């Protein structure tokens, strides 16, 4: 059982300081901080990380949703990363969820975070280059894999 | 640099408040909450259980007991600190406190 | 409705705080404070006793903070007193009893 | 041991609803209506009731029961008193069955209370030792 506690406006950036954003095609991608949304509103880069209490405490259970969107929540459904059409729910009657990730500090690096899928243990959010794009993907864990490390910046 | 501590009243009264406070060096990402017995958050209890939780928006969560039964007095009540590291827990059984 | 209540931590730490709260319907004239052992207010203790009191300037409150904790302090009878226009109310605690429970 | 805690601006009235005030001769009298007092509360190492001083707000003048009489000493209520009694410490207690009424017992002279006494056309603050005596009952307005 997950119960929603509190939400925080957050920006996420890979170790190349490229910022996570949602593009015109509803895709989670990364862009150089230089070229990231500079608006005070920051509609395309500001995420809400919603923290959940857990009946089976295993770490910090969170959902990640777009702050400016009506209903766009990150999902690992089917071992792939998409924006699912929904809001973070008041509760989830399940110990696993395609929209719940465990936000964990990187081993040896307290200032960096990784996000482990609650649905797929050992699978993490990662930044991956594909042609000219940098995509948010779900990839299996090799210690010190830097592609799964992020800086999470409050508001 | 990480801890969870419960403050409890030295005597039972009509309304009992247990105060759980967390201390974590991850200041932007830390919270505390209660688990009743093995695995029930307060939200999961049957209605009118006599347990209520107040989450303060250092993280704090108060657990408020009313219409206290012997099962409640002997229940293991756990406060959990959640942050980017592994959850940290502290627990109390009130009947042990009160009968000392 | 008149009462005095002490909250204590379930475990000892480097800095231990006891919270004393009173409840009195004499709103302008009620207060709580600590007495260490038989008859010493915190004000009367020698310096570096390890006790500090924080009286909050009706639900009067006084916190007692213990540092550099000794066995004498662990075994000391600590009393919180409610004062108002009626007979004083007291509650007490001996920490070693709570912590060893 | 008495340790000062908090004070409160107070208007004191006797049993006849007459207000306590200090007159030209520095005498405490009561009249229907200088009238603003400060009641300062003290913690006590020997809890017996609410220990207070009464002083004039328009200061330095503090009520005293020295020698079993009423006087106003030129002094401010002290930060502490290292004794278990004092001519300036009174115990403020509510009247049994009347929470709204207060009595002030001298800590120095047990059994002696502040009272209102009619003397000709005047009503005077006095100290005196009659269960239910109304003359030692006061109301305090904050």
Author numbering:
A (entry chain D): 1 to 141, 143 to 156
B (entry chain C): 24 to 80, 90 to 132
C (entry chain A): 24 to 80, 89 to 132
D (entry chain B): 1 to 33, 44 to 69, 71 to 140, 143 to 155
Authors' account:
Furthermore, a crystal from the complex of IL18 (8S) and a three-cysteine mutant of YLDV-IL18BP (ΔC21, C87S, C132S) diffracted to 1.75 Å. The two structures are essentially identical to each other with a root mean square deviation (r.m.s.d) of less than 0.4 Å, and the three mutated cysteines in YLDV-IL18BP are distant from the IL18 binding interface. Therefore, for discussion of protein:protein interactions between YLDV-IL18BP and IL18, we will mainly focus on the higher resolution structure of the mutant YLDV-IL18BP. In the triple-cysteine mutant YLDV-IL18BP:IL18 structure, the βE–βF loop is not visible in the electron density map, suggesting that C21–C87 SS bond stabilizes the local structure, particularly the βE–βF loop. However, the C21–C87 SS bond is not critical for the overall structure of YLDV-IL18BP or its binding with IL18 (shown later). The homo-dimer interface involves mainly βA, βB, βH and the C-terminal helix H3. It involves extensive hydrophobic interactions in the center (I29, H30, V31, P32 and V33 from βA, the aliphatic side chain of E122, V124 from βH and I129 from H3) flanked by hydrogen bonding and charge-charge interactions, burying approximately 1,700 Å2 and 1,465 Å2 solvent accessible surface area (ASA) for the wild-type complex and the triple-cysteine mutant complex, respectively. The lack of the C132-C132 SS bond in the triple-cysteine mutant complex caused the disorder of four residues at the C-terminus beyond S132, resulting in a slightly smaller ASA. However, the triple-cysteine mutant of YLDV-IL18BP displays nearly identical structure as the WT protein, and it exists as a dimer in solution judging by size exclusion chromatography and dynamic light scattering analysis (data not shown). Therefore, the dimerization is not solely dependent on the C132-C132 inter-chain SS bond.
